[PDB]
């Protein structure tokens, strides 16, 4: 898990070095946006269901032929389509992490390493949850500085699948 | 190696939800005292020889067979030494404090230390004193009031208290 | 458990040796002047105590930070057990010089007492400090050369025994080193 | 298994057969050496 | 002393002549009057038998006054006698209250018993009786089974039996029982692996995993590894043991694999040049070379050969080689 | 690693003597068989991507615990590891038909496999109701009659199944 | 301990299914064969005084060194443990065949024996070819080929049972391996 | 690794004092075997194959499991793991015998036999006989004045013989 405090940490480790003014600049920047990124976590806490269903809609406006065809790897079903709604609900749950701990530690961890493992296995696109991501990205509501926290780790999201 | 907040979020995602509204707020709190953290460290930083200096001194002026001919930490090869297990918790404690759990201490420090002590005949029990004569020499500093604004910073230095109880307990 | 008596016939028993008269002329040495062993366990098991009664007293002397604060002798039950801790290796000593081997301070002291005072963190400079201390102090018996006291003996060199239990003494810190 | 061949005074004659698979002894004609090593002194 | 095979005994040097030479049972069905120097002696072979070579003073053995004169006549010894040392303060400050509920559990064993139990189903049936029934059916739940009226009838003292196959205990039980007997020198205080403060067996009683079986007394058997899971599940770490199991490419690449356990090294030792590098003697981040020691490794019959070199050249002891 | 042919090599050399003629007309047996031996392994490892996906879609439908959050094969690192391990049993049984003994199966793969899953937590008893998945879409698999001439290879399909439920019982 | 009757409840347990059809047909065919390893075990355990015959004074013509005194058969306490040690390993499979299943051979013996042995000093390439000279032993009896004894049975063909008993044996010897 | 004149200065720091006079004569006995150790090395150091062939010579012969189908040392690396395991206990104790201890003995050989033997299953039996059968080979080799005065050698026959029987109660 990288964060901005066990990063430097570890440039402190590697030299054998108390923490310094330089240390201590890594983490008073994470305190003074830590204030902008905790609402938009709080925010796209509270509006998950508006946004986890509203991002699978518009994947089956854009990809129609996924509720259409038959086979286990598409929406087409009644299970086919509550397994695409755990999912974005599991891009959307490792993007509010990361506003917490202000890095891409939890997405790294738990999302983004063993990845194209699955995708090439189980027939799914990665490009299905790029339109599920450009969604939540220009329909969260929010604003400012806020908006600027949410737009930098949903795009990471969609550089890993990209 | 995680932190305060990785370890809040580790607890959520293998529960499989969101975090709750108590705890944004119990993280909120968390950066609202973290010029208080950020003062407390750098008391202990510049001041990081010291103490460490002043503890072996106290220490080694109470405890007299260690200095002895033929003692544990005699020798000038065995002296070094000594002083770098007293400067290296004195880090580890340091880099457990600003990241507000210690778990980072534990692992890349204490996992084991008393084993690794087991097998150099070490008398583990003085050491446990040298963490108790540098624990009240760091809170006597990270209660020092100069040069800074005067608040109420009680529950941090029982927390920097308990990073080096908790080093002070798995050494013997 | 191993005796000189039978010291030779765990070796023995490697070339299935039937003993002719050879290398029993030992034996028959061990015989010979076994009494100066005899006359010395007599001279070690009625002056046992006030062994130990200087041995950590000798230590305490130059080694005097282990009844501080921070020590291992501080309290009545730190420093007790401490006594019984130096009586008991002098008496693991004399068994084996009326035996004649090495067996008894190895197959139940030293199979495992290295592991016992580190996990203690009984001080192995101190805790052979004073088993130096009671080197010199287990000779002058055998030798009757102390400042004190005379034991009747009759005059001859037992020095062959006067050193082995200084090659007792040896390897008890063998591992305690 | 085949006859061992036309024996000339060699000592070692190749046992022969053997049991439930088997086979190989080493024959000094009757007695059947085969690695016991006579030739053992050292030099002391 | 060491060997195996040195005078046709395997298990004398192992830590247990006096623990197989003597019996101690008592030969009169009441202490008789008069002579006080031999059931005394039946006494202080209880009082380090039943507290495993603990200290006992005088100045405790006579606050626990009246429960050896009671068996003298009115109790049994070894179901009564010291069930009554099992109920005293001195007792209950060594084996009771100063750790866990397993490790009281798991040191009564070798204490009342002289097994190890295995598993955690023999671990089942007697923390059933603490939580529902107190403490003194916890300690009488030993005292009336099958697992005690059998071994010793009610007159011997008892002993230590888990090496043999008539106590049925497991091939395990056999390798936790050298982790608990450390010769005839030790305590359950003056031993390594666990002191008072502390559990014995916490994992390995618990999933029967067998060890490495050491000798007492051996060169570098001041060696034991400390305990960290791996894995992401239960978020462990790693680093800190060499696998149990070598398994894979590298398990027959180099002929069949072993398990090695070193005891530790130091700074003077790493050269070849017998001394130390005299300088700053360290690296700027100011840990070992082996930044902490009593480390194993896993390594092929293949490559046994520099690795005997690389740890014997370095300062490094060997408790054993177990091939996995 | 052994093939049936280096068997009765170590199962003579330690006995001495050389090979005895009434072994090796079974031996000349099993290269009458050794044309229906390695369409067997063509027909496995063609569809090797087609059991383990098949069977793992098949094992999550009816445990749904694993892949239920703080499951063991939650997230998407213990998901690919559940689909490499997987993958592993389906190489060393193929590897056991091609060869005429378990050997090379329990040695480099079931030696400690079941010690290495109560380690890390698994369910031992699941991955076996795994592999008899895959022991029934393998045997199945290699019954058809397409691609080769027809003809009796029961013999030789229930070596197939021999090793299935061989690391049907190293597991739990 | 484990059934194959047990085996496939817990089968059944984690997936939370009922007990189908689909499993049930190995288990009924297994009744009907019960008399077969019913015939199979009683001749294993009647002759079990030959097997432990040719256990031990079998593999001691093809390594002598342990007779030789120094060896590891040398003393009559190792003459006789080693005439015991075999008796019991044959007793644990007699159990594990009926029930199936090889766990109960796991934790009883096979899980910790091989940790005890480097301890109790016993080589294990001596063990396996004791272990396998009781393999070939035991795989005669149950066919009804062996040499000086003929046994009573029935008439069939208990290969599929023959290798389950050859099944075993190799895991006996891969246990001290 | 510490040597003989090491011990007396290990006894010198662990007890803590300077120097006695009677410790510095005790090294003279040293020097009155120390041109006597130095052509000690010379019977033994040029004698390097002819030791440990003249003893392998007869150590299969009395015991012939060794060279047994299914016998220890059967294949060529294996019987060339002998006498790379012969020569090292001599020439550890050739190490030794210029030392005038046995602590580098101790070191690099010996702690780490029993139970490597015992992992392998080579036997403790055997291995002390290829002590015993270059015992008497080098009591016998070291014993004469072949290129060196005559006089008193009665001590080090007694110490490099002191050495092997110390390997051999290091092995059984
Ligand atoms: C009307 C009278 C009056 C005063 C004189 C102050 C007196 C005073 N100073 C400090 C405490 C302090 N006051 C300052 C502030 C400063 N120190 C400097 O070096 C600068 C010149 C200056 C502006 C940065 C600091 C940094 C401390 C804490 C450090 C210290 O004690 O030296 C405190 C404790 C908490 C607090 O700040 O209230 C008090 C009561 N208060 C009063 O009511
Ligand atoms: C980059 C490095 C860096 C630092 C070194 C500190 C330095 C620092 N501390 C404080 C600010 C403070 N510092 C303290 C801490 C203390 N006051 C005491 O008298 C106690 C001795 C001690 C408790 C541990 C408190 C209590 C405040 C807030 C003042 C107040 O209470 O009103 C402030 C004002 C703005 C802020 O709160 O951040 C600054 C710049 N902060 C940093 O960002
Ligand atoms: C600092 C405090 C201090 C002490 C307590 C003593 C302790 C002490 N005692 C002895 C040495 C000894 N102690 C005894 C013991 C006894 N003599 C008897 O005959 C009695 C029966 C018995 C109890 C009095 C003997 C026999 C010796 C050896 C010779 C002697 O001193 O008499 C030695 C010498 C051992 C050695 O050489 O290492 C020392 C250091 N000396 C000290 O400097
Ligand atoms: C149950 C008790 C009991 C014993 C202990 C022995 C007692 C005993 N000790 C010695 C005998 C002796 N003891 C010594 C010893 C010494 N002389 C010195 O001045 C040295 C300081 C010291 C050497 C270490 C010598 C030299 C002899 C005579 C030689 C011999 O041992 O026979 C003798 C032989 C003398 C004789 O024949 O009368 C006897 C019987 N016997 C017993 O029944
Ligand atoms: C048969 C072999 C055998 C032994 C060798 C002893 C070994 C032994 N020593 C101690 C225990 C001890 N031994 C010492 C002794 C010393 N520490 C020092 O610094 C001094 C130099 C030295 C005295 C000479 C001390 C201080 C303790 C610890 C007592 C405590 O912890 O309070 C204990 C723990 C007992 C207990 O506290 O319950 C045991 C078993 N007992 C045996 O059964
Ligand atoms: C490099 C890869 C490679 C292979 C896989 C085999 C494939 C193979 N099989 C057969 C030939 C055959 N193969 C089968 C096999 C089968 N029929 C069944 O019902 C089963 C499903 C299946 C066994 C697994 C049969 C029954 C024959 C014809 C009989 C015969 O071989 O004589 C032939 C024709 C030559 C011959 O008859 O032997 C070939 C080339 N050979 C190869 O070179
Ligand atoms: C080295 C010295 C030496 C011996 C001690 C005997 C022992 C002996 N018996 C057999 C071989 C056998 N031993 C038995 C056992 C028995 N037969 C019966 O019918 C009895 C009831 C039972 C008790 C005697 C059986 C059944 C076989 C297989 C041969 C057969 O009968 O088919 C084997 C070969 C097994 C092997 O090594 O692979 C050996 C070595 N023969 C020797 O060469
Ligand atoms: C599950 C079954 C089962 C066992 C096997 C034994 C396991 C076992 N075997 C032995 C002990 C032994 N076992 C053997 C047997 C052998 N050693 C060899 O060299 C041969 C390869 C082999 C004979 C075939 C020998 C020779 C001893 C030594 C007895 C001793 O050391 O005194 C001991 C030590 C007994 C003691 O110390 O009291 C134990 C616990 N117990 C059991 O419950
Ligand atoms: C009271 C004790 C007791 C027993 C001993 C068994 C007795 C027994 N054996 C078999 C029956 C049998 N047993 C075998 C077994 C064999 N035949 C062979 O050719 C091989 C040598 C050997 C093992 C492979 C076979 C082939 C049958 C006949 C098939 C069957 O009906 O089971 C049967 C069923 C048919 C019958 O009634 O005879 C019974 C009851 N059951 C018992 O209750
Ligand atoms: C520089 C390298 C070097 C060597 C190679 C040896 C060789 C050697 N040894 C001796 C000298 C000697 N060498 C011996 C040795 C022996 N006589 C015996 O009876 C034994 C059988 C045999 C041992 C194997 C003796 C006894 C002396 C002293 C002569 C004497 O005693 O008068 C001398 C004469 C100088 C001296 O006395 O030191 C030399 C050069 N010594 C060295 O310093
Ligand atoms: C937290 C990190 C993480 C990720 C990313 C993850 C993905 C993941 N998605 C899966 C399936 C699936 N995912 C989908 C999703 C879709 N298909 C469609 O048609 C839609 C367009 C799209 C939704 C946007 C479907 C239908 C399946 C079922 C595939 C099958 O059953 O074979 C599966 C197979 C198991 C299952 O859910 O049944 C995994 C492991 N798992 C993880 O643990
Ligand atoms: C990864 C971080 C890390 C850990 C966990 C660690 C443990 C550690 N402590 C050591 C030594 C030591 N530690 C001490 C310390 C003491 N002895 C006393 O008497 C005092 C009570 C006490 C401190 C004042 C001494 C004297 C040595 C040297 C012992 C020797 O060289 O034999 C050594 C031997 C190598 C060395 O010289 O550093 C290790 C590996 N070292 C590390 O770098
Ligand atoms: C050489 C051949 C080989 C074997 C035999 C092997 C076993 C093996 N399986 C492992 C983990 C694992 N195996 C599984 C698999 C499962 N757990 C479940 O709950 C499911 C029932 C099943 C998947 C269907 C999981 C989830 C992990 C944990 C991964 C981790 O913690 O990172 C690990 C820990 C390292 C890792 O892969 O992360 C090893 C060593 N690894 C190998 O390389
Ligand atoms: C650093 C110094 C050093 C030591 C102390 C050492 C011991 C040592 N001896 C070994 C083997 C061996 N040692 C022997 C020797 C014997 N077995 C017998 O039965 C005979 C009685 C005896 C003398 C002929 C044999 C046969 C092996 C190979 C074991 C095997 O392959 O089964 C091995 C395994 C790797 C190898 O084959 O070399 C080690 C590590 N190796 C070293 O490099």
């Not at chain 1, 695409?84 to 790294?108: E, F, H, K, Q, S």
């Not at chain 5, 101690?24 to 069905?29: G, S």
Request: contains cysteine; glycine residues 8%.
């Amino acid at each position: 898990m990288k964060t901005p405090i066990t990063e430097a940490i570890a440039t402190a480790d590697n030299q054998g070095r108390f923490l310094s003014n330089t240390e201590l600049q890594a983490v008073n920047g994470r305190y003074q946006r830590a204030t902008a990124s905790l609402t938009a976590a709080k925010a796209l806490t509270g509006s998950a269901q508006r946004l986890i269903t509203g991002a699978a809609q518009a994947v089956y406006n854009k990809f129609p032929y996924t509720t259409q065809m038959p086979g286990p790897a598409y929406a087409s079903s009644a299970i086919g389509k509550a397994k695409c709604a755990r999912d974005i609900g599991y891009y959307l749950r490792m993007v509010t992490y990361c506003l917490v701990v202000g890095g891409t530690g939890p997405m790294d961890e738990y999302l983004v390493a063993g990845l194209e493992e699955i995708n090439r296995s189980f027939d799914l696109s990665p490009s299905w949850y790029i339109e599920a991501l450009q969604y939540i990205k220009n329909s969260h509501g929010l604003s400012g500085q806020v908006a600027n926290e949410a737009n930098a780790y949903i795009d990471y999201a969609i550089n890993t699948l990209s | 190696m995680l932190d305060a907040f990785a370890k809040v979020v580790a607890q959520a995602d293998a529960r499989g939800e969101f975090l709750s509204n108590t705890q944004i707020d119990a993280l909120s709190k968390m950066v609202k005292e973290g010029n208080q953290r950020l003062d407390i460290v750098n008391k202990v930083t510049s001041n990081a020889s010291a103490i460490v200096t002043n503890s072996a001194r106290a220490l080694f002026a109470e405890q007299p067979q260690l200095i002895q001919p033929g003692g544990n930490a005699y020798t000038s090869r065995r002296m070094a030494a000594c002083l770098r297990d007293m400067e290296i918790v004195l880090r580890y404690v340091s880099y457990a404090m600003i990241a507000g759990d210690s778990s980072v201490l534990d692992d890349r420090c204490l996992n084991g230390l008393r084993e690794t002590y087991q097998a150099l005949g070490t008398p583990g029990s003085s050491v446990a004193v040298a963490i108790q004569k540098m624990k009240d020499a760091s809170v006597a500093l990270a209660n020092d009031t100069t040069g800074t604004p005067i608040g109420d910073c009680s529950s941090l230095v029982a927390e920097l208290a308990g990073y080096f109880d908790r080093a002070a307990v798995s050494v013997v | 458990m191993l005796d000189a008596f039978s010291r030779v016939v765990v070796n023995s028993d490697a070339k299935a040796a039937y003993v002719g008269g050879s290398d029993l002329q030992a034996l028959k040495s061990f015989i010979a002047d076994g009494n100066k062993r005899l006359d010395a366990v007599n001279s070690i098991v009625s002056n046992a105590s006030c062994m130990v009664s200087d041995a950590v007293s000798g230590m305490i002397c130059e080694n005097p930070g282990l009844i501080s604060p921070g020590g291992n002798c501080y309290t009545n039950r730190r420093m007790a057990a401490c006594l019984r801790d130096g009586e008991i290796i002098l008496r693991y000593v004399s068994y084996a010089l009326l035996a004649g081997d090495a067996s008894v301070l190895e197959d139940r002291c030293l199979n495992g007492l290295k592991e016992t005072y580190i996990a203690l963190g009984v001080p192995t400079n101190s805790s052979i400090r004073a088993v130096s201390i009671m080197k010199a102090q287990a000779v002058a018996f055998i030798t009757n050369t102390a400042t004190e006291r005379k034991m009747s003996f009759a005059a001859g060199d037992c020095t062959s025994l006067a050193s082995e239990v200084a090659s007792y003494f040896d390897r008890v810190g063998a591992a305690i080193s | 298994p085949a006859l061992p061949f036309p024996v000339p005074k060699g000592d070692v004659t190749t046992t022969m057969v053997t049991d439930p698979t088997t086979g190989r002894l080493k024959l000094e004609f009757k007695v059947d050496g085969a690695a016991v090593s006579a030739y053992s002194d050292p030099r002391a | 002393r060491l060997g195996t095979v040195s005078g046709n005994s395997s298990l004398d040097k192992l830590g247990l002549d006096k623990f197989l030479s003597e019996s101690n049972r008592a030969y009169t069905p009441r202490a008789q009057p008069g002579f006080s120097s031999e059931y005394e002696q039946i006494i202080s072979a209880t009082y380090k038998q039943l507290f495993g070579n603990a200290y006992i003073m005088d100045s405790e053995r006579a606050e626990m006054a009246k429960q050896e004169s009671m068996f003298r006549d009115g109790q049994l010894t070894l179901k009564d006698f010291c069930r009554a040392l099992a109920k005293t303060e001195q007792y209950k400050k060594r084996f009771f209250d100063s750790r866990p509920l397993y490790g009281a559990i798991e040191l009564n064993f070798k204490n009342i018993l002289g097994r190890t139990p295995d598993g955690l189903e023999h671990y089942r049936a007697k923390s059933a009786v603490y939580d529902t029934k107190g403490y003194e059916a916890f300690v009488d739940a030993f005292f009336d089974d099958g697992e005690y009226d059998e071994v010793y009838d009610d007159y011997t003292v008892p002993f230590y039996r888990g090496y043999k196959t008539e106590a049925n205990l497991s091939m395990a039980a056999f390798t936790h029982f050298f982790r608990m007997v450390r010769g005839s020198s030790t305590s359950d205080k003056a031993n390594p692996n666990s002191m008072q403060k502390d559990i014995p067996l916490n994992y390995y009683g618990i999933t029967k995993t067998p060890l490495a079986v050491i000798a007492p007394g051996a060169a570098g058997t001041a060696y034991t590894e400390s305990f960290a899971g791996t894995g992401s599940w239960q978020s462990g770490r790693a680093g800190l043991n060499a696998a149990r199991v070598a398994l894979g490419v590298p398990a027959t690449a180099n002929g069949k694999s072993f398990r090695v356990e070193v005891t530790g090294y130091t700074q003077p030792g790493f050269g070849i040049t017998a001394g130390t590098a005299v300088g700053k003697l360290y690296k700027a981040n100011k840990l070992s070379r082996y930044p902490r020691s009593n480390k194993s490794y896993v390594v092929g019959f293949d490559e046994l050969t520099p690795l005997y070199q690389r740890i014997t050249k370095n300062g490094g002891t060997i408790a054993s080689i177990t091939p996995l």
